[PDB]
Amino acid sequence: EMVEANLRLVISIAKKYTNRGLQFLDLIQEGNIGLMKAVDKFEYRRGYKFSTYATWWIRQAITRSIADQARTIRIPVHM
DNA sequence: TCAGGTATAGCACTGAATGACAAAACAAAATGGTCGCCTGCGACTAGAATACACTGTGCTATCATCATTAACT
């Protein structure tokens, strides 16, 4: 239920990060994976909004995916 | 023309030269110890919710294959 509710937030972040990269579908899948990984560790005791945490996790996932994938040769994240 | 002789070659003989085996030393190569960098993984808590991809081949020249429309039976 949380994933189905936040799919719209995921696609909104994807639209805010509209780069060609590999493909929009791969970026949406990476955002969904990041959303799931954030939900698996999220709690409401902080008294803040889940939107910021989910956005940070999706940004990290997209950065890792564009640093590793979306290229012929594999380039590390530090490079 | 026959013969003494000097030039040239074979023969008797100890002792120095030349073979075979083993050991010590140096250089080339593979294996192992060690240092610093590359890299794989996790976390950062104000709010951010289908609008950003975007289109552009252009309507050539016909030719043949598949379900819906209309109507004869």
Residue numbers in the entry: 378 to 456
What did the paper state?
The structure of RamA‐class II activator complex at the micF promoter has an overall resolution of 4.0 Å. There is extra density further upstream of ‐35, which shows clear density for DNA, including major and minor grooves and density that could account for RamA and α‐CTD (boxed regions). In order to obtain molecular details of RamA interactions, MarA‐DNA crystal structure was used to generate a homology model of RamA‐DNA using Phyre2 due to their high sequence conservation (46% sequence identity). Indeed, the RamA‐DNA structural model could be fitted convincingly into the density, including accurate positioning of secondary structures and those of DNA. In this structural model, RamA binds at promoter centered around ‐35 and ‐45 with one HTH domain binding to the groove of the ‐35 element, just upstream from the σ 70 R4 (σR4). There is still extra density that could accommodate an α‐CTD, upstream of and contacting RamA as well as DNA at ‐55 position. By lowering the display threshold, the electron density map suggests that this α‐CTD most likely is connected to α1‐NTD of RNAP (thus is α1‐CTD) although resolution is insufficient to confirm this. Each monomer within the TAP dimer interacts with either σR4 or α1‐CTD, while the RamA monomer instead uses the two HTH domains to contact σR4 and α1‐CTD respectively. The interaction surfaces between RamA and α‐CTD and between RamA and σR4 are relatively small (≈60 Å2 and ≈100 Å2 respectively) and are mainly polar interactions in nature, as confirmed by the structural model. For micF class‐II promoter, the transcription activities of RamA H31D, RamA Y75R/D76R/D84R and RamA H31D/Y75R/D76R/D84R all decreased significantly compared with RamA WT (P < 0.0001).
